[PDB]
């Protein structure tokens, strides 16, 4: 029974819907809760083959690490008629980049993620790491408060939110630095 | 893979997997002089008698199957 099977585990929450159909649940219960091991990715039982292009069409093409940006190659790379291309062979010009071998002997020495407890899955990008108590900069600007966000003054009167019951927000039951006024 | 002992597959049982890791642990014990000596220290026996009891426990461990 999926009911009583939940009494045999320190963290029975690990047991799930299809878990009761396992060939050896009396073990998998004890494995899945192993100390430092990580969960199985969730993209199965979703038939979508692990990705679609919905959220992936709004992403930037790429952005360089700051160590590579300060170098100055970015502006050097940027157009040509065909006969100019056969002229570019007959004419040819040398040294368009003309990089500083001192600079590219400098950056990656002189100048120059996630822990193990995380794993990526399909749709996850920003959300988990905007929460009750955590907001973005600009919307601070529209709000215009100098370094609580002021409707956590009314989270005093009307009470802690039904939606996020576990809530703590600064100064009330949560005894705050920078942006993040609640956890 | 098959002819390489310890090879697993989707139908692998608990009992077989754990008796595998047992036997492999025992081959490690036979292997490393020190850890063996640690065992001899803790429970007082000869190096010999230790290795002998292990070689007895090679086929059995966990006991009968299911």
């Amino acid at each position: 029974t999926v009911a009583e099977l939940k009494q045999l585990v320190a963290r029975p929450d690990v047991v799930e819907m299809h878990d009761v159909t396992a060939q050896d649940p009396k073990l998998l219960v004890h494995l899945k809760a192993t100390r430092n091991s990580v969960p199985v990715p969730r993209h199965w039982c979703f038939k979508r083959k692990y990705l679609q292009g919905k959220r992936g069409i709004e992403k930037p093409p790429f952005e360089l690490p700051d160590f590579i940006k300060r170098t100055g190659i970015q502006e050097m790379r940027e157009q040509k008629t065909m006969k100019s291309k056969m002229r570019e062979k007959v004419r040819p010009k040398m040294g368009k980049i003309d990089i500083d071998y001192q600079k590219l002997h400098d950056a990656f020495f002189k100048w120059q993620l996630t822990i193990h407890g995380d794993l990526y899955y399909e749709g996850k990008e920003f959300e988990t790491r905007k929460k009750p108590g955590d907001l973005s900069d600009e919307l601070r600007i529209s709000l215009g408060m100098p370094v609580p966000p002021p409707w956590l003054i009314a989270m005093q009167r009307y009470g802690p939110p039904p939606s996020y019951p576990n809530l703590k927000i600064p100064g009330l039951n949560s005894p705050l630095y920078g942006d993040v006024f609640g956890t | 893979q098959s002819k390489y002992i310890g090879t697993g597959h989707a139908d692998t049982t608990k009992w077989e997997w754990l008796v595998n890791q047992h036997r492999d642990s025992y081959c490690s014990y036979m292997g490393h002089f020190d850890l063996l000596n640690y065992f001899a220290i803790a429970e007082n026996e000869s190096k010999a008698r230790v290795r002998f009891n292990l070689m007895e426990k090679m086929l059995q461990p966990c006991g009968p199957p299911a």
Binding site: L27, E122 | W15, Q21
Partner: protein, 260 residues
């Protein structure tokens, strides 16, 4: 050998003529071609000629593009890649996809040839692999994974494992697919990651998948667990967790609990 007797202008013309020799139907032709291209890369120096490689239209498949990629590798060796990388990494920006996966290959062969020297550049390539390994289309995951492989063999033992773990995160979801090239790619990937990271972390990702109810997950995680199992079977001993003993069987190994 000599290479001084001829002025540079002649050389760069030789380059722009060499570029289309890569249509050869023969492999040895391309061989000598790429090696020469490296030699003249030494005769001149990197930036111009690697730019002339990045000019490539990518127009046909293999038969070949990826030979130009190999030229990017060997060129990156002939003078220090310690110079060259920013140009390439910038050239992943371009919206044209096949050349994006092209420069991914360039990183792959690149680390394959540089070996130890990747103890630094790992960091530089790490976020880009993040962008690539996060999938636009399968070839990204594949090629990027190959990069993770050769990087993973190359850097071994030098203490950079952390970022390789981070990249292993993004590697890990790709485990599931039926496409032969991406699955064998991922296999090579997780093998190199096995040796570099050490088995313990691997196994800590491979535990729960063994007994999972579904057949798929068991097929795969058991394939992986076998790959982890054959090599380094000696070192696995410590990392098998504690598993409680049932009625008919004693699943606790008490030897490890003997305390002086």
């Amino acid at each position: 050998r000599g290479a001084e007797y001829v002025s540079a202008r002649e050389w760069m013309r030789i380059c722009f003529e060499l570029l289309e020799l890569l249509k050869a139907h023969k492999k040895a032709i391309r061989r000598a071609t790429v090696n020469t291209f490296g030699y003249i890369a030494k005769a001149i120096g990197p930036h111009d000629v690697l730019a002339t490689l990045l000019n490539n239209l990518k127009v046909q498949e293999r038969q070949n593009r990826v030979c130009t990629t190999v030229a990017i590798a060997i060129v990156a060796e002939t003078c220090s890649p310690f110079t060259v990388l920013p140009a390439l990494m910038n050239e992943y920006r371009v919206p044209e996809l096949n050349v994006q996966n092209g420069v991914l290959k360039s990183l792959s062969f690149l680390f394959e040839y540089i070996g130890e020297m990747g103890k630094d550049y790992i960091y530089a390539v790490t976020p880009l692999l993040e962008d690539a390994l996060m999938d636009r289309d399968l070839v990204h995951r594949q090629t990027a994974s190959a990069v993770v492989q050769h990087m993973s063999l190359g850097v071994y033992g030098f203490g950079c494992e952390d970022s390789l773990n981070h990249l292993l995160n993004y590697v890990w979801p790709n485990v599931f697919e039926t496409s032969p090239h991406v699955i064998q790619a991922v296999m090579g990937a997780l093998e190199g990651l096995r040796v570099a990271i050490g088995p313990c972390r691997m196994l800590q990702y491979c535990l729960q998948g063994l007994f999972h109810p579904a057949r798929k997950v068991r097929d795969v995680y058991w394939k992986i667990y076998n790959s982890i199992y054959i090599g380094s079977q000696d070192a696995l001993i410590a990392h098998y967790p504690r598993i409680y003993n049932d009625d008919k069987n004693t699943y606790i190994r008490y030897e490890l609990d003997y305390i002086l």
